[PDB]
Design a protein around this ligand. Structure first.
Ligand SMILES: N[C@@H](CCC(=O)O)C(=O)O
Ligand SMILES: N[C@@H](CCC(=O)O)C(=O)O
Ligand SMILES: N[C@@H](CCC(=O)O)C(=O)O
Ligand SMILES: N[C@@H](CCC(=O)O)C(=O)O
Lengths: 255, 258, 258, 255
C-alpha cells in the first residue's frame, strides 16, 4: 500500500478519549513500519450538538436532512473547524506526529457550492486542487482536515463529512476508510461486498436496524469514487495498523 | 521591503465588515504591485465575549490576559481558531487571495508553555520552527494564523495575540505591524511621531504625555521591538488608502525601536 | 395589542448594522399599521469591552454583572448612555422615527439603589415614576432608554439591562420582549415552545433539556414575568419579517408565564 | 423675567466640582423665588480632551478650527452626550431638580447639517423645533442638552456648544447666558456694551490676551440672535440668581 489514504473519523469516535488514544497509538505503530501518505478528515460529534443545545439552536429539517441557518454557521464553524480540528491536532502533538490542521477551503482542496437555498449554509462537496495537500505530505506533515468549506463568493458551508471525505479522496487519488463504531457486517463476518450486495442485505433486513446509515454512506462513497471504500471500527485497535496498510479488517464495499 | 511581514490584527478589525473590507482591499492593492511574503496574525474580538455571555460564562481579564478555565478553553479555541480564523479565510477567498488557516501549534510554528497555573489555559509564546510557514510562503500561500497554541503535552492554550505575533516574527525573521485603532503616538503638541525610540517613549511617559492605556500599548510595542531586535510599526486601519504603503515599509503611523 | 410595549435589545443587536437595519425596518413596518406605544430599552454591547481594552482597564463579569469600579463608571456611562443610546437615536432619525434618548434617572423613570458595595457602581433597579415617559408617548415620541441610572445621592449606576427592562415595564404597565440571539426555548424533541409556563420550564431543567446558559436565560425571563405578573416574550432578531407580528402581540419565539 | 433662559456651561465649569455645586445651588435658590423656564446647554470640558489623549486621538486642525474624524465621533459622543450630560443630570438629581437629559437631535430641537466635508463630523447648528422642549418645560422638567446632533441622514455631529446654544435660544425665544470663568470686562467694570464696542476694545488691545475668544463668542451669538447675550462667571455665585432673573452681573453684549 503505497498511495495516499484518507481516514475519516466518525462522530462517536471524536466523542471518546478512549477511541482517540487508540486511533493515535495506531497511527504511530503504523508509521514506524510503513510510510504511506496519511490524511485525516473529520466532522463533529456531540461537541457540536451539545453546544447547539446550550445555545437553543434547533436541529431544523426541511423534508429530510439537516438545515444550517444563517444564525448557526459561525457557531458550527467554531465547534467543527475550531474545537474538533484543534482537539485532533492536540492528539497529534501528544503523539509527536507533525500535523497541520486545515479545512476544505484551504488551497481549494475540496470545492464547495450551495447545495440548496432551503437548507441554508450546507455545502455540496466536489473534488478541488490537490496541490496544497501534496505539498504538505511531501514536506512530511499529516493534514487533519475539517468538513467546513467556503464558497467561491466567501460564504462558510457546513458539509457532510462523509461526502467531504469522498471528494477529498477523489482529489488526492486516495483510498478511503470511514472509521466508526461499526466493526463490520455479519451473516459469520463479511470482509468484502459490492455496494449492490450491501443494498440487497439492507433491502431484506439483514443489515442491522441502526447502521443502515453507515453502510449507505460507505456504498455511496464507493460509487461516487468508482472504487472501494472501507468501513472499520476503532474497537479492535491492534488491527488498525493492518487496516491502514490495506487489510479489510471490517468490511470493504467494492464497486 | 523584501523581508517577510507579520501583520497582527487588533480586535476592532475582526468586529467590523467595513474594517475587514478595508484591510482586504488594501491587501489586494498591495499584492498587485508587491510580492513580499505576508502572514496575518490574529486574536479574538468581540465574538469570544459575545459567546461567553450567551453561555453565561464568567469573564476575568487583567493585565492583557483572560483567565481561561478548563471549562472555557475549548469554546474559546472554537471562537478563535475556528470562527475568527475561518471568517478571515473567507475574506481571503472572497478577495481571491490563496490563504491558509493555521494556529500556533501547526508545524510547531510558535512553541507555547503554561504561563501560570492560576490563569488556567493561558500560554507563554516563544519562537518555534519556521519550516511550515516558509514552505507555505514559498508555495505562494498567505498564512492566516490564530493565537491558539498547544503545549508539548497536548493541552490547548489561549495566547495573547501581541506576544504570539512577536514569537512569530522572530521565528520568521519577519517585520511586524500591530494594526488596531491606535494610529500612532502623539508628542504632546498632539502630533504624530513617525519614528520613536525607547528613549523618546520614556521621556514621554516620565513627562506624563503618554499616560494610562497608551502606556500599556507603547510597552507592548517596545517589548515586541526588543525581542525582535528591530523596529515595529503601530498603525490604524482607518486611512486604508495608506495601508499598501505601510505594507511596503513606509511608517504611516509610528515606528518604534531600541 | 394596545398595551405599551418595552422592547429590550440584547447586545448582539447593537453590535451589527445588519441587525440594527433589520430591527429598525421592522419598527417602521410595524408603525405603518399600528400605533401601540413603543419604548426601546438597551444595555451596552461589544463597545464597552472594546473601550475597556483600549484603555487597558480590567474586566470582571460574573452572574450577569460587571464589577464597575469608581474609575470606570464615567467611561461606561459614556459608552452606554452616550454612544450606544445616540447610535440608536441616529438609527431612529435615519428611519424617520421621532425618538428621544433617555436614561433610567430621567424623570425618576426607574429608581436605582446601590446593589452591593463590592461590585462598585452597580445599581438595583425598581419601578419609579411613569410620568415622564407617559408624557413623551402621549406626544408621539418613541423613547430609547439606556440602562444607566442615578441614586438619589447623585451617583452614576451601571444597571443590568434585563432587570432595568423589568422595572421599566412595571412602571409603564407595559408588555416586555427580550430580543437577542435566542429565538425561543426548545423542548428536547428540539422543537420551539410557543408558550411556556414556569412549571414547564422546571420540568425541562429537572430533566436536563434546558441546561447551562439556557438556564440562566430562562430564569431571567421567568424573574421578569413574576415581577410583572404577566407574560414576557423571548425572540430573535433574525427572521425580521416576523418582528412586526411579534410587536403586534404574536408570540413568534417563546412566551413565558407564571 | 418671564420667558425662557438658556444657560450654557463652559468647559472649565464642567471640570470643577466647586463650580457645579455653586451653579446648582444657584439654580435652587433661583427656583424658590422665581419660575422662569430654564434650559441648560453644554459642551464638554477636559473630560473629552483627557479621554482623547488616553486614546491617542489627535486634535487635528485644517487651516483653523477643529476636525472631528470618523474615528473620533463615537468616542466624543460618549464623553459629551454621555458622561458630561449624565454628570449634570446627577447634579440635578442631587439637588432635587426634575431634569431630563437631551441632545440636539431629540425632537429635532436644533437641526444640524455638515459644516464642511474637510472637518469631518462637525455640525453647523440652526434653529429647529421647539415642541419637545416646550412640552418638557410645561410638564415641569429642566432639560439639560448636550452639543451633539444628528444629521437628517443619520450621522452623529460634534457641534460648537456656543453655536448650539445660540441656535437653541433662537428656537425657544430664550435669553442666553454663556457662563464661564470670565467674570466681566473692565475699563472699572462694564455692565453693557454693544458687540461693536466689544470688537473695538479687542481691536485696540483693551480686552485681555486670553478671553478675546470668550467675548467673540458672545458677540457672534448676540448678532446671530439679533438680541443681547450675557457673559458671566460662576465665581461670585451669590449673584447667579440675580443673573437668572435678568440682572447683568457680568457683561451684557447688546445688539
Ligand atoms: N461527525 C459526524 C457528523 C459530522 C458532519 O457530517 O458534519 C459523522 O461524520 O458521523
Ligand atoms: N481571550 C484571549 C484573547 C487573545 C487576544 O486577543 O490577544 C487572551 O487574553 O489571551
Ligand atoms: N456592563 C453592564 C452591562 C449592561 C447590560 O448590558 O445589561 C453590567 O453588567 O451591568
Ligand atoms: N465645553 C467647551 C467646548 C465644548 C464644545 O464646544 O464642544 C466650551 O463650550 O467652552
Amino acid at each position: 500500500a503505497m498511495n495516499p489514504l484518507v481516514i475519516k473519523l466518525g462522530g462517536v469516535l471524536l466523542d471518546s478519549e478512549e477511541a482517540l488514544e487508540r486511533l493515535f497509538t495506531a497511527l504511530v505503530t503504523y508509521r514506524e513500519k510503513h510510510e504511506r501518505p496519511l490524511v485525516i478528515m473529520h466532522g463533529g460529534g456531540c461537541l457540536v450538538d451539545e453546544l447547539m443545545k446550550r445555545l437553543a439552536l434547533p436541529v431544523v429539517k426541511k423534508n429530510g436532512l439537516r438545515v444550517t441557518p444563517a444564525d448557526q454557521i459561525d457557531i458550527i464553524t467554531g465547534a467543527l473547524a475550531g474545537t474538533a480540528n484543534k482537539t485532533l491536532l492536540a492528539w497529534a502533538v501528544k503523539h509527536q506526529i507533525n500535523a497541520v490542521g486545515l479545512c476544505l477551503a484551504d488551497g481549494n482542496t475540496v470545492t464547495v457550492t450551495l447545495l440548496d437555498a432551503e437548507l441554508g449554509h450546507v455545502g455540496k462537496a466536489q473534488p478541488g486542487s490537490a496541490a496544497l495537500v501534496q505539498t504538505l505530505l511531501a514536506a512530511g506533515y499529516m493534514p487533519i482536515i475539517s468538513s467546513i468549506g467556503i464558497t467561491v463568493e466567501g460564504q462558510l458551508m457546513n458539509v457532510n463529512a462523509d461526502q467531504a471525505a469522498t471528494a477529498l479522496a477523489a482529489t488526492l487519488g486516495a483510498d478511503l476508510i470511514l472509521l466508526s463504531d461499526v466493526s463490520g457486517i455479519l451473516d459469520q463476518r463479511i470482509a468484502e461486498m459490492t455496494a449492490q450486495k450491501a443494498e440487497q442485505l439492507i433491502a431484506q433486513g439483514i443489515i442491522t436496524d441502526g447502521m443502515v446509515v453507515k453502510v449507505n454512506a460507505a456504498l455511496d462513497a464507493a460509487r461516487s469514487l468508482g472504487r472501494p471504500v472501507d468501513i472499520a471500527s476503532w474497537r479492535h485497535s491492534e488491527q488498525l495498523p493492518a487496516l491502514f496498510n490495506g487489510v479489510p479488517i471490517g468490511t470493504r464495499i467494492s464497486v
